[PDB]
């Protein structure tokens, strides 16, 4: 049982690490998407003028 516990610990560490990576990615994307919506509004205004 000790060996299985250690192995599960290893697997958990790996998954947690990669998920931290994905969280950072998601935040960066959030910033990108804010900029994106701003651009959309700009374009609409240019249309009208």
């Amino acid at each position: 049982s000790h060996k299985q516990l250690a192995t599960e610990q290893y697997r958990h560490v790996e998954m947690a690490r990669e998920l931290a990576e994905q969280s950072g990615a998601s935040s960066d994307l959030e910033t990108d998407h804010q900029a994106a919506s701003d651009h959309l509004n700009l374009v609409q205004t240019a249309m009208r003028q």
Binding site: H12, A16, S26, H33, S37, L40, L42, A46, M47
Partner: protein
């Protein structure tokens, strides 16, 4: 016209709807990715506990 030059955005209608589509699908894809990351993290916490 000087204002159009100031904004500088070429802002074509084709480009307009295209951009809005791109950015909106981008928003929703972002949200989905964030949800998936959260789901996986919750799984990992389950395993650890």
């Amino acid at each position: 016209l000087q204002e159009m030059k100031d904004i500088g955005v070429q802002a074509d209608a084709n480009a307009e709807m295209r951009a809005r589509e791109r950015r909106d699908r981008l928003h929703e894809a972002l949200s989905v990715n964030r949800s998936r990351v959260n789901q996986l993290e919750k799984q990992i916490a389950f395993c650890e506990a």
